């Protein structure tokens, strides 16, 4: 599913991402935009063989199990397929654990290079929340 900007912002807000561990809702909307362009079925095979899954492109090397990644630590304790649903619950829950790690949102290259340092609140402006 390809989310609409405000549709996703509202969903993420309901899923408790606004100000989660210090990150305003805009950061998450922006991260999803640049990681997958709001596409929950997004998938990218990495160089090391691992694969990024979902709207937040969570990697199978550390976070989920896709049964084809030798290193896979499956820190989020879920099959990567759960991250390809139009129901963002699984991705959000995993994202929360990820961000609870030392790197914070820095775990997402797209957020580090396209969102950090900018007016991320712009991503939720005009949305009724």
């Amino acid at each position, epitope marked *: 599913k390809v989310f609409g900007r405000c549709e996703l912002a509202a969903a993420m807000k*309901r899923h*408790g991402l*606004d100000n989660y561990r210090g990150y305003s809702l805009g950061n998450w909307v922006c991260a999803a935009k640049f990681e997958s362009n709001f596409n929950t079925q997004a998938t990218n095979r990495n160089t090391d063989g691992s694969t990024d899954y979902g709207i937040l492109q969570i990697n199978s090397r550390w976070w989920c199990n896709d049964g084809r990644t030798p290193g896979s630590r499956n820190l989020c304790n879920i099959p990567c397929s759960a991250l390809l649903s139009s129901d963002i619950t699984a991705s959000v*829950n995993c994202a929360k654990k990820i961000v609870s790690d030392g790197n914070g949102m820095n775990a997402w290259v797209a957020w580090r290079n396209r969102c950090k340092g900018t007016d991320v609140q712009a991503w939720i402006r005009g949305c009724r929340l």
Partner: antibody, heavy 113, light 107 residues
Framework: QVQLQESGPGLMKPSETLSLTCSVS????????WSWIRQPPGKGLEWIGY???????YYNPSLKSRVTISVDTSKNRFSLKLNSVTAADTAVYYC???????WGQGILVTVSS | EIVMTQSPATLSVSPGERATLSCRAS??????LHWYQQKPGQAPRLLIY???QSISGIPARFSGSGSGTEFTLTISSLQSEDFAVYYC?????????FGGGTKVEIK
């Protein structure tokens, strides 16, 4: 089946350093986030801190830098270190997975002046 | 830190009766509120996570609702084994904090 188990001194004197360990079975210590929580007798619950997969730690400011949480991947366990203990530190100490899904049974630690 | 306040401190319930426990956050925490049940001499057991998500193995009579700063744990028809102290806990902000607890006891 996942099982956490706390172990350490049940009695100590003030100013001493509390050392506790939590051994895990049925799950890999290096494949998750782990924490410590305590409950003073007759009181509620207070988070002590947790350590994530990258080794980064988060400590409760209420402890005022007297706490250390570390991991011993070789023995699939993690520990808690609390310096300069006083009666205010008497409590049942629990270890648990970050997600809160699994908890140790807790260990009573009494600091006797 | 975010202050979590539970009410009532003690809740008397007759077996079979509905039980409603409240929890409030000093500031908005979205859906980052988890409920635990703690029986004497035992560690708290997670019942509900992220305000309303259920855990496998947990009786259907346990249900959580609410968002922002007001949350509720409902036991549709309390059974005698449900007597215990219940705690809410937020994970939106570090340090994570627990409410003061609600002691549910037989009436």
């Amino acid at each position: 089946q996942v099982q956490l188990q706390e172990s350490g001194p049940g009695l100590m004197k003030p100013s001493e350093t509390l050392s506790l360990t939590c051994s895990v079975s049925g799950d890999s210590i290096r494949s998750d986030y782990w924490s410590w929580i305590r409950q003073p007798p007759g009181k509620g619950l207070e988070w002590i801190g947790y350590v994530s997969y990258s080794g980064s730690t988060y400590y409760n400011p209420s402890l005022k830098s007297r706490v250390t949480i570390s991991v011993d991947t070789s023995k699939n366990r993690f520990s808690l270190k609390l310096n300069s203990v006083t009666a205010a530190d008497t409590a049942v100490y629990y270890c648990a997975r970050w997600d809160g899904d699994y908890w140790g049974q807790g260990i009573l630690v009494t600091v006797s002046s | 830190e975010i202050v979590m306040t539970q009410s009532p401190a003690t809740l008397s319930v007759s077996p079979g009766e509905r039980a409603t426990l409240s929890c409030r956050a000093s500031q908005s925490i979205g859906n980052n509120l988890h409920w635990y049940q703690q029986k004497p001499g035992q560690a708290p057991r997670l019942l509900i996570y992220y305000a309303s998500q259920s855990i496998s193995g947990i009786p259907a009579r346990f249900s959580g609702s609410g968002s922002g700063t007001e949350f509720t744990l409902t036991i549709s028809s309390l059974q005698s084994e449900d007597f215990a102290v219940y705690y809410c806990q937020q994970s939106n902000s570090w340090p994570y904090t627990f409410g003061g607890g609600t002691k549910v006891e037989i009436k």
